[PDB]
Design a protein around this ligand. Sequence first.
Ligand SMILES: Clc1nc(Cl)c2[nH]cnc2n1
Ligand SMILES: Clc1nc(Cl)c2[nH]cnc2n1
Ligand SMILES: Clc1nc(Cl)c2[nH]cnc2n1
Ligand SMILES: Clc1nc(Cl)c2[nH]cnc2n1
Ligand SMILES: Clc1nc(Cl)c2[nH]cnc2n1
Ligand SMILES: Clc1nc(Cl)c2[nH]cnc2n1
Ligand SMILES: [Mg+2]
Ligand SMILES: [Mg+2]
Ligand SMILES: [Mg+2]
Ligand SMILES: [Mg+2]
Ligand SMILES: [Mg+2]
Ligand SMILES: [Mg+2]
Lengths: 233, 233, 233, 233, 233, 233
Amino acid sequence: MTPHINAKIGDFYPQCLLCGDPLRVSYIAKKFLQDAKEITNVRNMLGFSGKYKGRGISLMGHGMGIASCTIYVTELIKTYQVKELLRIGTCGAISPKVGLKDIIMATGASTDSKTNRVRFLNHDLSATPDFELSLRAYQTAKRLGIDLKVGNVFSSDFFYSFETHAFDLMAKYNHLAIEMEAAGLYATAMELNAKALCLCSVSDHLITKEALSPKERVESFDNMIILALEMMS
Amino acid sequence: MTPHINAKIGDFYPQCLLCGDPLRVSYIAKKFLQDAKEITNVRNMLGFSGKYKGRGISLMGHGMGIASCTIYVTELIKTYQVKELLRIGTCGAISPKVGLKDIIMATGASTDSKTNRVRFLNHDLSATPDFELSLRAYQTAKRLGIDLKVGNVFSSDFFYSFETHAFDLMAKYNHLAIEMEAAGLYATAMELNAKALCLCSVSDHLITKEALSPKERVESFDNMIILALEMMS
Amino acid sequence: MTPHINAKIGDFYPQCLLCGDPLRVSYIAKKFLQDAKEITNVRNMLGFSGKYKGRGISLMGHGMGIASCTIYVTELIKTYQVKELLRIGTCGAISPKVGLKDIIMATGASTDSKTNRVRFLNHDLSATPDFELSLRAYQTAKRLGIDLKVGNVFSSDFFYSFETHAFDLMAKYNHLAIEMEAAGLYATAMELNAKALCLCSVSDHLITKEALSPKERVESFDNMIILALEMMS
Amino acid sequence: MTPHINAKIGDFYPQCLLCGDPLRVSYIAKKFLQDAKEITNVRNMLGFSGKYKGRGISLMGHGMGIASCTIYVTELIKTYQVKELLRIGTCGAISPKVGLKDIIMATGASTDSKTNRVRFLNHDLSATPDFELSLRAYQTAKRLGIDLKVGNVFSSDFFYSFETHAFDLMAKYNHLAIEMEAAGLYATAMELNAKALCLCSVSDHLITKEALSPKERVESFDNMIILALEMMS
Amino acid sequence: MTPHINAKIGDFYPQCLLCGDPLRVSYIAKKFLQDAKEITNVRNMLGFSGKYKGRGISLMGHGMGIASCTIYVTELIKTYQVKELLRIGTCGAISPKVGLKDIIMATGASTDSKTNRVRFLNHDLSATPDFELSLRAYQTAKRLGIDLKVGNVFSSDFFYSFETHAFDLMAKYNHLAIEMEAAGLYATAMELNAKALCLCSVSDHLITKEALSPKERVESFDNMIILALEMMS
Amino acid sequence: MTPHINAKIGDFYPQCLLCGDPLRVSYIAKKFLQDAKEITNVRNMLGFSGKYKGRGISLMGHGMGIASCTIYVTELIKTYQVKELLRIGTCGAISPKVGLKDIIMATGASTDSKTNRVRFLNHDLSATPDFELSLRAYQTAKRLGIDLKVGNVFSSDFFYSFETHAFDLMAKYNHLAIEMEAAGLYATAMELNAKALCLCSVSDHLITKEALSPKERVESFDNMIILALEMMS
Ligand SMILES: Clc1nc(Cl)c2[nH]cnc2n1
Ligand SMILES: Clc1nc(Cl)c2[nH]cnc2n1
Ligand SMILES: Clc1nc(Cl)c2[nH]cnc2n1
Ligand SMILES: Clc1nc(Cl)c2[nH]cnc2n1
Ligand SMILES: Clc1nc(Cl)c2[nH]cnc2n1
Ligand SMILES: Clc1nc(Cl)c2[nH]cnc2n1
Ligand SMILES: [Mg+2]
Ligand SMILES: [Mg+2]
Ligand SMILES: [Mg+2]
Ligand SMILES: [Mg+2]
Ligand SMILES: [Mg+2]
Ligand SMILES: [Mg+2]
């Protein structure tokens, strides 16, 4: 129906888990869902619908960066009637308050993008998640025994930053890590009256240069997948 | 020992309620606190310390606008050891999702100020409250039977706006009301690693133009004072 | 009559002395005026009308920062028919050309605020005083034998600056001191076709670190008060 | 070896064709290359190395938006030593000088992104291709009988624009069409001293609403693919 | 001695009259000065030194636009030791407070240029003249019977404006006319510790569309030349 | 027929060589053209029409800086029907890729001006030349044995820069030299659907501090004059 999704209307459940990497979306479908069906594959951006503990859930890839994420989120809401969007992904830590394998709930997404100024009268849009979803993540993490870290992230247009000298200042202002999509998800969900939240897993520390190995990346990401699926039950 | 506060070091409790109007601060001290002492009065900007249900509580006026708010909040944190700052105040509603008497909890504060661009590398700082405090407000409001509305506010440098044509756009993006200080409170608490939250009571609707009577403004504000004091007890 | 002033129309004389501190406004009324009457007290922001050497003079406090100052100045012009607004206050000197106790007449007010960009097509508004009032201040200072320093000030949204490294640059560009309201007074008076001027007294030197004692502050400020009242006779 | 490309060092030829859609990349490898090997597939972002008329050429997908494109282009140039990057793709025409089927060569890429201001001291970076490549494209098109349209494109962070009222203005300034990556490819190739060029095929007209069927889209895209490969051969 | 001035060190008097049009500079030297010597002519941009009523007077052309004016003013101050710079020129009136043949003294120069943001830490520089010079102009105009109009001008990078819809707003904020150099003269003189002032004669009314004939333009300009020379004696 | 040009309609050929220095325009007319006639001289900004190798050529001075250039280019296109504008000039090198006496073809013109943001929706206009003219310059330089350097220039509002610390960054991004008009010529020709190109000759190296002597300046400029006239023949 859209240039970027070839699902039929109704193929998506009203709650959708989002991730930048469509191969990880496929991995979640195979490992954690029952009866999962591939519903879209335009540009190799895979999405699925299946069941977790008897509950229907959808999964959709969104690519990297605010511009890509905004395209998919816009279409999910406007065309596919998605109401609740839970994004997961990795991030690079910049604060001493977090370490490798930590899960962060982004109560705000700062950015170096111009997109929110374009959307919002050239002023400062404070891009934020839906509070009910934030409460649900916090409650579910308490239930599962997960030490959820809570603060802002910085959504950058740059993976290869030209402003590494500014990381300490961002950490001072309660930015725990850097990723590339949260501000676009939040602003699009705000634009279109939908509920959204971003969780992210610390795979790399940008201050120490320490990184997880491939094997511990998969293990730690699984912990955040389970948090997300449990919160959608 | 600041240009703006003449309290002695140690006169403030670590939890402080903030309001822009020092006469409303004095009203809270007289009506709701026990043994309230006026601890500061530079520029007629009054602050107090007293007890609510046996628990020490301080109150501080902060004046109008981000620049004034920032001065007082900075001094409270850096000189007076204040750790938790709960701002209450009125606001002008701009969204159909709220009406007069509603209490809004601002999970984000957008702004037309340049102050956060000056603080934050000329990028977009998403100014947000402390999550734990927002959870406490949610739980306390539920206990008290308050239908707490949760979303963004827009903190303006203007009371007499030159951009009233933009109010519908702001409301579309989940801005429930306009006030003049929240983004500064939030940014200063982020800067200084303190816990802050803003609650605001809808006194007027800037769109549909309804307005509370002076007698309803008292009952509605009292409702929000009680929420705040119960939160800090 | 407004949310911020509870005077009756007619209570203000057409010339009004402005100061951020309502307690200093009261002090001027009691020390320097005859038959002074308190005409407003909303938010503890006092204003008065009285006589100086047989001539009617009003005084009004305006709080701290551009947003606070703009609210009061807007209402004084639009509602209370004030035509001439003479602001006094303290400042932090940044130029070697001034020292403690000097009085500065601001022939321009630069700013880090975004307010003038919002007002003025996103361009640079050169915020300036009324020329007749500047001439009167210059002539009155000569008459009184005051060495009036004439240059720009920098009106900042920050008392606790994040840009102290730029003070020398600002002084190079003929900024003699920093305060927090002149640019808003000037822009509002420009907006509404009224006459405004700001004088400020050097209470502290931000470069040399020299500072007046509490008692020296009161004595030098009196010299400014006299200059101002004399220009309004 | 890089986070977004799992090719071996040396798997890329120094000439690489780029496209946002990795499924079109795989289509090109299957239909136009001989002995094509899939050399990378992280995030389902496919790249290939194969031969066209006896010469080795590589293909790489880059996703949607400047941020995504910049990631892949940076890694291609640095880790994989790619020297010539020829991007093809579709675009939405905004000018009367072009229509469906037309191939545009972008001698400049304007943008609503902030990325180039971040890169370029907050000034205006004129993002441009390598001139020798643009000359090779012009000569190859002439030899093949292609009526190459030459002008600027506008690279937007938005597929769903909030500024459709501005399309006529852009077309007046010689912007023939809108796409989402050219300015990022050009800025990154400038940063890293590599040769880049963007060609795009008009598949939709955003003014008139002309739109090609899936069959015409394939046939018109083939003409661009052949132009690109002939340029590299 | 500089790339733009071929005068010898010492050829300029410390007082210099400035004008954009070097042909008008030559006209002033021939008609109003005694013993006038042409001291510079690079790029046909003429300067002179002569006598007016026994007093040494220099004249220098500066071209059109802030960037051109800035070049000449910088060299006059830094290399040729000029201390006082009095600019005359024409302007396009935008205010009902002025009409054809009026002389405006610019106590502020607003601008659409980025130059002052580049100079002034990305903030708003309020570009203003030296007050002593403005007082001398006021007194001299009174002595000569000239009804000098006093307010801001808007210095634009555009003669052929793209923002004519904004002229009324500019006029509301006390901008009497538009020209193209004042803000650059004022900022450069502030930078380099020199005394500057701009006067301009209304040659065309941009609102009412009134314009002066070629012959009328000459006679009204003479009145401003005499004012400037009388002020410099 | 305009405020800045007093030629009659029809006095300009449709191809015009442009230079900032009207005395250099005069020098070109007398040394390289046959039957040259002065056609305009407002503000001493000279322009001529003559023949080179039997072919009609016009020459016009445009002064210094984007604002001055824009005035003349706008009038030449809109009033005098000029269709092709070839600008020559000097520049200050900032890249190791170029040295004194090198001729640069500017395939893009970056800028610190605000003019293109004002023209272009506050976004980034990539200011570029006409491709056919650039091909003609490239081919003509090859024919004449000139080693034409091809890259971006930076068109600045400043001859005396406040940002010399950024020169290396701009060179990294393929900016070979700094001048002051190219971005304005390019934006105006794009605005008005005309063909433009800028060549510039390195007179000074801003990094190494090398400079040409006065006689070297004339001799090296002659080589680019011949290049330009040859491409117009
Ligand atoms: Cl390690 C890492 N991860 C992510 Cl998600 C990033 N986003 C921007 N820079 C980044 N670095
Ligand atoms: Cl009614 C109302 N209240 C507040 Cl606090 C405001 N701030 C800015 N505009 C406003 N309107
Ligand atoms: Cl000492 C001093 N006084 C004032 Cl009024 C100020 N405004 C901003 N910084 C300041 N410092
Ligand atoms: Cl049809 C179309 N195609 C592309 Cl590539 C676009 N980019 C931004 N808007 C767009 N519209
Ligand atoms: Cl009539 C006229 N004169 C001048 Cl000096 C101008 N500057 C910018 N627009 C203008 N119009
Ligand atoms: Cl040497 C030199 N030449 C030119 Cl054309 C310039 N433009 C800006 N700075 C400059 N330096
Ligand atoms: Mg991820
Ligand atoms: Mg309030
Ligand atoms: Mg004060
Ligand atoms: Mg594409
Ligand atoms: Mg002039
Ligand atoms: Mg030149």
